[model samples]
Every structure is written in structure tokens, then in C-alpha cells.
Target: MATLGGVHDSNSNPDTHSLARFAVDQHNTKENGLLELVRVVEAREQVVAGTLHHLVLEVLDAGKKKLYEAKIWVKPWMDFKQLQEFKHVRDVPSFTSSDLGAKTDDQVSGWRPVPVHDPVVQDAAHHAIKTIQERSNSLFPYELSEVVHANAEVVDTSAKFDMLLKVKRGGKEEKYKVEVHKSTEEGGFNLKKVDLDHS
Candidate 1:
């Protein structure tokens, strides 16, 4: 199982609220014996609670099998805010019909849903792939062709290492800078990883 954590700071993040911070897993099999595999993702490993699903992922294969393989699709998403609310509800017991009426200072707050536009997958995939690839190259050794990165000359620190290698592709070749500075304290530097693929 693969696990990941993230927060949606903006409304423009995922196509739906369902794409919020999560842990995902998946698995699959092809009876033809040509390809058979399974994948799994876990959001919380302790309780062993997670969602299971399959992804009909289409891959541009080299050999002309002239067919498509069903890919496993697993994604993790959870609302920590909801968890906090649950804890709050647990700590602050609620009044029941049978219970005596006690002085209640806490009050329910107003709530409103934000109107969001879920773009088509094809269009979103076309625009988001570049940024996604660039984010990947920032973490991995092999650079993605579509994602661009800064050269060593751009920074003085970590000059010896491949501090920043960006991917460039699709007629739009723009190099994006990646920070290589480390914090003064041990493991104090904030690390970020974003991995996603567009089909």
C-alpha cells in the first residue's frame, strides 16, 4: 500500500472535495496471464480502514496488443478537520433527551458550501500534467521530459549535487526553480512531495 498526506489550501486544487488529503491503495488482475497485478493504498494503517477500488487506466503500450488493460486506481483522502470535530464532540458531550438540561455555552456555527466547478478530466489532465511532472522531477532522480527544473548554476548551496533538475517538453520549455536550502536545525527543513500522473 502507498500512503500520502496533503492539504487543500485553495479551492482550485482537486476536481472535487473528495480529492482532499488521503491515503490510497489498489489491486487488479488480467486473466489472459499477459499482465496481472494488484495495488493497494492505505490512509490509516492502524485501524486498517481504507477504500478499495480499481482504475481502468489506459497505457500507451509499446507492443500492439491492440487492447487495453484495467489498471488499479487507489487514492487516499480524509478530512483532518472532521477528525478534530469528532474529538471535540467526544470531549464535549452533547445533551440528550433523557439527560438533564445543563448550561450549554457551545453553539452551532453557520455553514455554507462553496460553489466549485469540476472541469472535464481531459482538459484538466492536459493542463495539469506539466506541473505534475515538474513536481515529480523535483523529488526523483530521473527528470520528466515535460517538467522543467533549475540548473546548479542557479544556486550556490548543494552545487555538487543535482540540486534541481526540471523537465521540459510539449513545445513549452520553461525552467522552474527548486529550493535547495536546508534549515539550521536538524531535519528542520520542510519537505514536500507531489506525485500524480495524467493519462
Candidate 2:
């Protein structure tokens, strides 16, 4: 069985060997084979029980000549950066079941950077910008330009991250702060609130 191990802070990059793997099961063929990750159907974080992540994946077991869905649990903290990297992939590379063994070293080389997008961050930013534009239009009676800048900060919190987005309107600069909360649902987040800031 694949285990996440433990939780850690956000700044630290998680051991990919530990975070990504195939779960052991009776149905899974023990033979060494490659699995093509089709897509990340979902990614979620659970805050109440420390910091943990559950990722739902769609995979193609070419050796088995079948497609299936599997879930992987992450421990030692849910690294949003790594999660985001997986969200934007066209096709997740193939990997052997042995390659996913817990004994594998974290420094294993020749790995391709998987594409990913952080739904927690992405959704928070989306809602925040929508509110910001609405407020800007009502207050200044002008349409706010699209997001000029956006960045995320993993502050000194256990399961929360801050987003800072800057926009432009009427030749003036505007700023907004968005708070994102880890959701209990698989691969989902709660956009707590969006605050307009002068700074």
C-alpha cells in the first residue's frame, strides 16, 4: 500500500517519490509495468487532521490493457507547488510500479516536470478578481483591466494561503487580497473572502 508518510511545511518541496505512487491492491497486477497518468480528476486537502492531501487520478495501465481510477494520499504537508505542477500536464509520464516503491530516493534524476494547476489557488484568485472588478466598477464607474499580477504566499498558517492580485482601472492601480482555505472535499477549496487593500 502507498503511504503519504507525514506532514510538513509549505515551503519545503515534498519528496516526489513519496508523494506520487501506485497503491497496492489485490486487483493490481504485481508485474512491473508503466502507468500513463491520464489526468488528475481531483485534488483536495484536509485541514482538521493536520495537513494532508488526497488526489484522484485517471490512469491507463497499458500492461493490463485497461484504464482505471486510483487515489493517492499525501503526507508531510500538501505542497501546493507540486500539486499545481500536476494540474497543467498534457500527459503524465509513464512510471513503473517498482519506481514508486517507498524505498525510492527523493533525489532520483531524469524526472520530467509534470504540469499542474492549484485549484485552491486558482479558484480563490478567480472569485477574488470577480469581486474586485465588481467593486471597482461600482466605486469608480470604470471597468478594471484584467489581472496585471498575481502571486501566492504560504504564510505562517497550517492550511491556508494568501493571494495578492494587482489590477488596473482608469489609469490607476488596484490591489486585492484573497484568502484560500483547504477544503474537505476531494480536490476542492473554499474562497473565504476577498478584501480590497490600498497597498
Candidate 3:
């Protein structure tokens, strides 16, 4: 038997800056984004079989400065670095009825902006965030910071909930998208997936 490791605080030095830059470049290449790096907001490292770098990067894209959370894995022996995930961490919805449209008899299916204090959205975020932490090895817990935006869609007996919320993960505030769904209206919500919001 052996003991393993979890993510620990890392310095925002030159080493991680390179990784952050690589992450931004990779994101740009993948999504056709013109993102420029501003700084490394924070960094963390984990040595689980190999090295994993967790970085928060302040970036400029579409003329607006934004924050992106990224993860990179490194293998020293192979001299390889791979970007795992680069997600936009501050994509609050703008004030408008852009995505709202009633098409034909579309009374049962569409995504509309939701109130921050909506009971359904709050419950969805609470359950999804806790489930997200359960899937990780980090000892620190997340405190829900702000409920940015949410939406709901229902068609017949199917229901889906999309929520965007900020949570204080460890030292920094990060935004995530919560996707929950259920087949029957009477059944409880099931987490489809939770990810750092990319859009």
C-alpha cells in the first residue's frame, strides 16, 4: 500500500507562467479565440503518478479581459506537457432577451434566463457543487459565491436545468456550469455533468 498526494498551493513563478501561456495558446488554437495572457491569477500543483498544474489565468479575448482556469499535465521523463482543460471562469450572461424566443407552439421547450434566487436553480447548484467536490481529492470545500445565471428546459416528462454559479474554490472564486436532468418530473434531479464554464 502507498499514500498519494492531492493538490497543494504553488507559487506563481516563471515555471507556471509558461504553463499558463501554453494553456491559453492551446485554448485559442482549439476554439479559434484571440486570447492574450495578462497574468497568472493563482496556481496549484499535484503529483499523482505525474505532475499536474492547476492555473488561473487572466486573459484578454474579444477586447474584454477575462479569467480562465486551466489544467496541464507534465511528464518530465518524456519532456511532455499536455493541456487538459481550459475553461472560461467569468462568463456572466448579459442583460438582454437574446436567447428568449417563442417559436410556434414552443411553450414546452426553450432556455430562458432564471432569477438568481430561484429555488430550483439554487437546489441544482447546491447538489451539483457538492457532487463535484465528492469526485475530487481536494480537502477544501467550495462555498457558493454568486449565482450568475440559470435556465430551464422541459419537454413532456423530460426536464433539464442549466446553472452558472461562482464558488470559492480554495483561495479563488471560480465559475462552473451545472447541468442536471431527469426523465420523470416526479424523480429527483441527477447531475449530468459539472464543468468550469467555457462559454
Candidate 4:
């Protein structure tokens, strides 16, 4: 006797890659998302009337890298393809311990509360909103819709600011605590990272 649903690896298979691409594309369409396919990380398959492709992939969604699982059913013999299932598995947390700021080397001390209207600080906030919009792919485009609170600190000719921002697009709104700065080295603030906040 043989297994009815034998599982085998198909990570390097070209057809598997094709199916994964189609699956993600279909998923984005169905969900009204802007997810971009990074690569197929793992793939498995089982035999059926057609065939079932089980795929784990690295995908870029709204600027966050994440793993997603998608099951694509195909019947090449009958020219059929269907996305059976798709959902997020987990997030790919960025590794930023070294490049952004190393605690040991920099002279920047701690953040101090600052007025939100300062042109320099206001510009910093807008820069962060720009990053948010670019990364989020908001349907209606985002603006620095609200500034809940903000803080700033300067070291030498370099300045850094972290703030709670409420960006809006259409009727959608979300809060993020973003760290960004306008440095002497880089005129435009090199946004450190935008942390999605629920609390």
C-alpha cells in the first residue's frame, strides 16, 4: 500500500516557483493588498486528482517582511489553477542592532520633550510620515494626519527625534512610534524604523 497524500520537497522546482507567484498574486488581488513576492523559501507537494502545492514564502507586505503560507491546487493536464488557501505565518523582525545605532559608540544621550511646531522637528515628523506612506502602501495615501506627542535630542550637528504619529488615509488610521533624525552626515532624516504601536 502507498500513502494517499505523499509529501515531498519542491523548493527548487520551477513549476513550484511559478505556482507560488501566482498564488501570492491571487492572494493580493483577493485581499486588496500590496504584498510583494520575495522568494519561495520552502515547498512541498502531495498527489491528488490534480496536485496540491504547499508553499512557505518570504513576502514583503506593506514594507514588513513576513512569511506566508499558500496552497495552490493545479491540474496542468486540464489547464487549471486555484489558490486554495493563503494566510500570514509570522513576521520577519528586522535585525538592526548594529547598523542603526550601536549603544557603545554613539554620544547621543536620551530623548527630551520638545515642542512639535519647530520647523526642524516638524520636518522630521513629516519625513517619518513619508516613510510610513512608502512602506505602508495606504490606499488613499497618508499624511502626517495627527501628531499625538513628540520628543527630540541633538548630538553635535546631528539631531534625532522620536514621536507618536497618527497617519491617515481615507478613513484608515494607525499609530506608530518612529525614530528619525536629520543628521549632519545626511540632511534628510534617515528614518531609523517605524514601530507599529497598539499601546
Query: TM-score for each prediction?
Result: 0.14, 0.30, 0.38, 0.38
Model 1: per-residue Cα lDDT at residue 1: 36
**How many backbone overlaps does candidate 3 show?**
0
lDDT of 2 by residue, 57-97 (tens): 55556533332323343334443222211221222332322
Q: Which portions of model 4 miss their true places by more than 4 Å?
A: 1-111, 135-140, 155-157
> 1 or 3, which is superior by lDDT?
3
**Per-model lDDT:** 0.25, 0.42, 0.67, 0.67
The reply for model 3, stretches above 4 Å from the true place, is 1-6, 76-79, 90-199
The residue-by-residue lDDT of candidate 4 on 27-135, one tens digit each, is: 5665547778787777666776667667778888899887776766667566666777666675332222223211222233554776665665577787778875576
Clashing pairs in 4: none
Q: Which regions of candidate 2 fall more than 4 Å away from where they truly are?
A: 1-120, 131-158, 184-189, 197-199
Better of 1 and 4 by lDDT: 4
Error of 1 at 76 (Å): 56
Candidate 2 scores a C-alpha RMSD against the true structure in Å of 15.3
- Per-residue lDDT, model 4, residue 25, is 72
Steric overlap count per candidate: 17, 18, 0, 0
